[PDB]
Amino acid sequence: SVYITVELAIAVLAILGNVLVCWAVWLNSNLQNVTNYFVVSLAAADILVGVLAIPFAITISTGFCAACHGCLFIACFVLVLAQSSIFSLLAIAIDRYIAIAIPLRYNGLVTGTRAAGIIAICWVLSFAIGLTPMLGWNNCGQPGCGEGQVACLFEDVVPMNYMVYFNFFACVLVPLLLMLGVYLRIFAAARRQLKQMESQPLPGERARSTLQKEVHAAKSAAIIAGLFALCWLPLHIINCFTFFCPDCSHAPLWLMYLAIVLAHTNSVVNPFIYAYRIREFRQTFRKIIRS
Numbered sequence: 001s002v003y004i005t006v007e008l009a010i011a012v013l014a015i016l017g018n019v020l021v022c023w024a025v026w027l028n029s030n031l032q033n034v035t036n037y038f039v040v041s042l043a044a045a046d047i048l049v050g051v052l053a054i055p056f057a058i059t060i061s062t063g064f065c066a067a068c069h070g071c072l073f074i075a076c077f078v079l080v081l082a083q084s085s086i087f088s089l090l091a092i093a094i095d096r097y098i099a100i101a102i103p104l105r106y107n108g109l110v111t112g113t114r115a116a117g118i119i120a121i122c123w124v125l126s127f128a129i130g131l132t133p134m135l136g137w138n139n140c141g142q143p144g145c146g147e148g149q150v151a152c153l154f155e156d157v158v159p160m161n162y163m164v165y166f167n168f169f170a171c172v173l174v175p176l177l178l179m180l181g182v183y184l185r186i187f188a189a190a191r192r193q194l195k196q197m198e199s200q201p202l203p204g205e206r207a208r209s210t211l212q213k214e215v216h217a218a219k220s221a222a223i224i225a226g227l228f229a230l231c232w233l234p235l236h237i238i239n240c241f242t243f244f245c246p247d248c249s250h251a252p253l254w255l256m257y258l259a260i261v262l263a264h265t266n267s268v269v270n271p272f273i274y275a276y277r278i279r280e281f282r283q284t285f286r287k288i289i290r291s
């Protein structure tokens with residue numbers, strides 16, 4: 001019960017923090033742009049974490065008895081929310097890129113409609129991937145609870161060749177490498193703009209000020225995606241240790257818990273990172289609380 005509380009504590013903060021981020025975008029129309037449409041997808045996702053993921057994660061911890069479908073769901077649901085966030089964070093990455101790179105075509109391309117469409121597909125593909133073990137790629141009955149029900153234990157029910165080759169390497173590592181690659185060009189061309197506006201026979205502080213803020217938002221976005229990888233890589237690397245190195249000390253349960261917990265923490269930093277990196281956001285939250 002010493003660690004049980006921690007998981008619940010995180011669940012609460014995850015719900016409040018993001019429901020606040022969602023309500024703030026519903027009151028302040030100065031946040032209701034195409035960009036923040038994806039932010040909500042990330043928020044709503046990190047909300048279902050403290051609402052479902054954590055409640056599930058803490059359940060399958062001690063293990064239980066239920067069918068394969070029911071078990072795999074309570075075991076692969078967290079893979080969905082995390083996978084959805086992969087799409088969102090990648091979207092935001094491309095978003096800030098289109099804005100800084102092609103400011104004019106930004107409005108003609110990055111529309112509020114296409115935003116909704118993408119988000120929808122992101123979740124659809126999020127379930128297709130996150131629940132792949134349910135498609136048949138699972139270990140239900142691969143050497144108590146009686147016929148029908150299965151001893152719902154993560155390691156015994158969820159494949160490793162999947163969460164490594166498929167999940168991590170492809171559906172997480174590759175995206176992060178793409179996201180990284182994006183922010184590479186973003187901050188690369190951004191400073192080129194400042195260089196071109198340095199040899200100009202005119203002030204034009206409108207371009208500079210606006211750009212520096214488009215960059216400020218891009219940087220703030222980079223800090224968001226950065227925390228994700230920083231709060232998931234540990235758990236994934238562990239899976240690579242247990243998998244690729246069978247003789248290597250199988251990660252301890254206590255260290256395994258800590259690592260798994262860290263992932264549940266990524267659903268809490270976003271609210272605080274907005275109220276910190278975004279002056280527009282913090283002022284909105286302040287209004288809500290006071291009033």
Ligand SMILES: Nc1nc(NCCc2ccc(O)cc2)nc2nc(-c3ccco3)nn12
Nearest residue numbers: 057058060061154155235236239256257260
């Ligand atoms: N190797 C491994 N073992 C387990 N075992 C379940 C142990 C456990 C489960 C829940 C909890 O709160 C504390 C401990 N869960 C695991 N979850 C993950 C994981 C999730 C996302 C990426 O890796 N890997 N993994």
